[PDB]
Give the backbone structure.
Amino acid sequence: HSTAETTLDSFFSRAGLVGEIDLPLEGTTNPNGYANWDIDITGYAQMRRKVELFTYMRFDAEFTFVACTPTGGVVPQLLQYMFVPPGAPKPDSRESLAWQTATNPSVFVKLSDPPAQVSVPFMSPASAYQWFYDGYPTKDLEYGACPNNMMGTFSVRTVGTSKSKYPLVVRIYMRMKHVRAWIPRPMRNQNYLFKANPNYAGNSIKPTGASRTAITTL
Amino acid sequence: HSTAETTLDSFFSRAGLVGEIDLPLEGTTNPNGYANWDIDITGYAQMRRKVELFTYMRFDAEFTFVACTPTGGVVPQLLQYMFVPPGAPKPDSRESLAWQTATNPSVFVKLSDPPAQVSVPFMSPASAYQWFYDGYPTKDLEYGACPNNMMGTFSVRTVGTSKSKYPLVVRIYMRMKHVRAWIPRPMRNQNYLFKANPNYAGNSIKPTGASRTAITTL
Amino acid sequence: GFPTELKPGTNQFLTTDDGVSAPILPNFYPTPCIHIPGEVRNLLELCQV
Amino acid sequence: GFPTELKPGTNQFLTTDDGVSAPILPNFYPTPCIHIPGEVRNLLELCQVETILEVNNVPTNATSLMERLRFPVSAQAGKGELCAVFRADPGRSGPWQSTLLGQLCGYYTQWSGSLEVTFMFTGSFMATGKMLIAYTPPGGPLPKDRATAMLGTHVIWDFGLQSSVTLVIPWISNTHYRAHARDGVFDYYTTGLVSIWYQTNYVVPIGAPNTAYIIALAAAQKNFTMKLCKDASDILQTGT
Amino acid sequence: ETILEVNNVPTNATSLMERLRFPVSAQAGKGELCAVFRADPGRSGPWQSTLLGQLCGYYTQWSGSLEVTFMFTGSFMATGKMLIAYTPPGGPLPKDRATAMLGTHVIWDFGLQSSVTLVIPWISNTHYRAHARDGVFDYYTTGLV
Amino acid sequence: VAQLTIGNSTITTQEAANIIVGYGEWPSYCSDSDATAVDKPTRPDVSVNRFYTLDTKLWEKSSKGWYWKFPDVLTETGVFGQNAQFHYLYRSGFCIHVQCNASKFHQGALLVAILPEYVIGTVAGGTGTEDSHPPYKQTQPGADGFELQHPYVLDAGIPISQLTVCPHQWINLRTNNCATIIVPYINALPFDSALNHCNFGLLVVPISPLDYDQGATPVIPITITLAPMCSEFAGLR
Amino acid sequence: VAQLTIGNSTITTQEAANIIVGYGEWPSYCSDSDATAVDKPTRPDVSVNRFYTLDTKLWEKSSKGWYWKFPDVLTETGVFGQNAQFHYLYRSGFCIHVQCNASKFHQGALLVAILPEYVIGTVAGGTGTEDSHPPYKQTQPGADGFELQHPYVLDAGIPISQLTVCPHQWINLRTNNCATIIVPYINALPFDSALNHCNFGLLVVPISPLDYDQGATPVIPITITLAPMCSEFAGLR
């Protein structure tokens, strides 16, 4: 019965899959053996609903990178995951001098080696992130969108001058730690429409939960 | 007469040959100048019977790698032995990004240099290894097989992008140290059928030891 | 070198397991947190509303 | 740089030598060991456990191997008759190979100590009689008849009374080196000789089994030693 | 202690004296099951011969630890081992000798001690019931020796 | 005569013969550290601590011997069967008591022993070419046990000639009958499954064949009674 | 089980059953007065103090019994045989240990005893008219003993019904097997010949005939092991 499983850190812990990069040898998606992933903790489906229980949050995260082949095979390919601190520019080519700039923390690891993990501190220049922003950050509709909440950008890529020899799939897991929440708000009860705002189906409004026949009949 | 030769460490010490990798220049076996060896302390014939004297064991091991040519010749070829901690994936190609991943301890040495040796700690996530498991690890027959008892995997290979210049034979010696045994059990008395279970010839059951004419005639 | 034997679970990734790993930005000093009214520390606080 | 001259044995690999070498996984913390009941610290602990001595190591048939565990005594036998006989050779092939003691010795080259055979009568309760167990130290061949056997260390065992007697073998030393065909193994030489005789005929009342069996349990005493290791093991690991 | 007629099979008039003892012999081979009965001091069965049993009949319910003793009356020259085993309520009579041994048992050797005693932990004839019409507190707790 | 009574059960066993305590350790609960540190495991002292009396097995002039597997044997019948089924983790000591009802006109000897992690191995086909891991009948033979097919090699290529190197006790008919063994929890894990992994096995083999002059009840009943000492479980389902 | 080890020998005899010390006296060396007063007799503590294990005799349903004569029995095989042959005078105590390997399915009883100055007497012809003093085979039957022809009168007109009046020990199969007797030097002379006069005789007779239901090894081996306690010799040749 220990009320410890109901804390905030015990509610928001656990490494969840938030990203899945894909470097097919040949095809459409990521045709340059590299891709840019913007840290988005909603990469985990049911996470949005959860964090959105509060108005202000603060936390750190431990990202883990489980990469393999689509088959699930291990291969002797060396990778480089780079981190783009919100504010610095991201790579655009397979050798944009971006991967070169030190102020962009990179971490080389082979697929042979166990998953790579690193910790991103609470970025935001604010006191805390905030899932809601009732205004405009002083043409276009810039409502509800809160600026400084950007945690950064991970840029995965196969080390080396030439393309990779095998197809690769990098899965990105992130567990948030040391959490502080504020201003609890009602629990979402209408399906989500966009990752952006809280819009909902303006006719397809369903009841918070299942319904019955008569109020007297159980 | 000192009862020290009867200890456990004095019974289980001594570097024994448990593995013999083979990198023929050209042929069938290991056609890629590399091979994956799973740490198996039964690589030493009479070892099974011995360790199997107990039900629970705990120990560390010092592996030594004596590599040469089939002839027994020494040559200026550099090798890389890598260790795959039970849990990480093994190489599958002559440059699977596996040999690149740091979390997979590698050790480069030339044949010029004396044998290479390293110590593997007691791996298992259990209190001890266990030669017997009377159950199933919560289609197929998964009986008697104990999961966590995997000590790891050594992956031998000729350093470098291209194939080796001479044929090679890497012999792997392992001496276990600091041993603790538990629950002594009867000494195997029927030839072994598979490395897996304790099955035996169900008709070819012979007496524990030689027999005589009459019980009165010595 | 100091003697070590590896136990099972080496090179293993447990989604729940929570040891640690280096900070991607060592010298970064996350803007201090100020005081936000009404912090929650255990969902059970909510269950009583 | 501090002055050093290398001595012979440099760059040498001795399978027995046990210095050290770095840990493949430095920061690995091997899950602590908890408490497992009954740990063994020296095989000699085992050598003192009584294990069934297959004195009746004659039936070789497949579905009879279970008989090797015990020899019999019955009405057919008359007073004086020799019941059974074996040697005090914990190492060497023979009845001792069934015992844990024996099997361990095989993993060793030489040894010495006092032994301890026990005899358990499993016959009816109504069964009575006397058996004469006798040990003849190295040399003196198996006593001609029961009489002369008794003139030396022996124990008259009466199952009418105590249903289980224990005999102590003074000392056996497998150290007297030898060289048979080519297996120059330190041959016992010191083969004592335990013989069991029918002191009285087997006596039973109407209604009881007119034949019983005796189980034998051996084991070495406290003062046992083992020197030199030898991995002689015919039961070897085979690739599926 | 009163004689437990474990061998309560011969009913013939001039054989009733055999009910006092069961036999063991050469014909039986290792492993063979010799005999078996329940820990039911009350209920009909072998216990009815004992004073204990007969008294229980004069009572409705009870509980306690029991104590069966076994006396080998064979020859003196007779030897061997019998394995007595008790299986608490539930677990049916062990399939074979082997499995029987994996539970509380006592290996009895008459070559040595000519008389062994087994203790039944506890039997409670309190678990009420209602058979045909004789709704007597049925054992339920029938151990198994 | 003196009947022990620990539970709604009452076995009328001998006053107090000799009992072999396994590996010299009384089964106990646990210090304060396990496979559950923020999960205080409830310790069934209720009906999980009474006497169970398995269906008596009949010993014939030919029985090859029998064996049971713990904790399986009881996960069947019993409220201890209720626990082992509705719980995830488990840790429990024991106390077996094998009794033998026979007359002074019979004879035999049973070796009763406890063998941790008792892994069976069938014929492996017939002669020895089939990696057929024994049936779900030999790995967990319920509360009615199972017979040995090759008593000499205990069904696992190990010689019974050495089984005494385990917690054992003899049952020589001409000398006794009841034999007792207190088994402590033996595992390489504090808390293990109580449904898939069988901490050990109880063997009971006729080393000296049962026998009787013709005319005596040919089958002697072996009654195995056991008591779960210090049961422990964690998380119900 | 506990194996005694006094010498390059190692008998694995019982832990410590009951041993009958002869005439209540432990064999010892000597005060300071003998058949040699200016001749300090060397006391072989070397290889003359180890375990000797005579060739096991086989007990049949019909064995009449056997006997050995000390010190003769060993003057044969052994370094104690070396001494007794190259020395003039001799004085030595003993310690015999007769073991019997049989199963609980056999039965019998052996009376094992020590009889000082055991003088044999053959048939005296056939019916009783020939002063033929027994052969050199019955007076000194080496290390393989000799069989009794008339067990009832111990081959010397004395009734075995009374042999227990000597240092003896019984070996009833259903109760034991090993039996021990410590013999002290018994003679009417401090130092006597160790080659012509046999200080005594060890008898071992089946009082209760050996027997076994048909099918058990019919011959039970009787193993006599002995140890020379306090050997003493004077003047070599």
Notes: Residues 112 and 173 of chain D are 4 Å apart (CA to CA). Chain D has one domain: 1-240. The interface with chain F takes residues 34, 36-38, 46, 49-52, 54, 65-66, 68-70, 98-100, 103, 120-127, 163-164, 206-213, 215, 217, 240 of chain D (CB under 8 Å). The first strand of chain D starts at residue 39 and ends at 40.
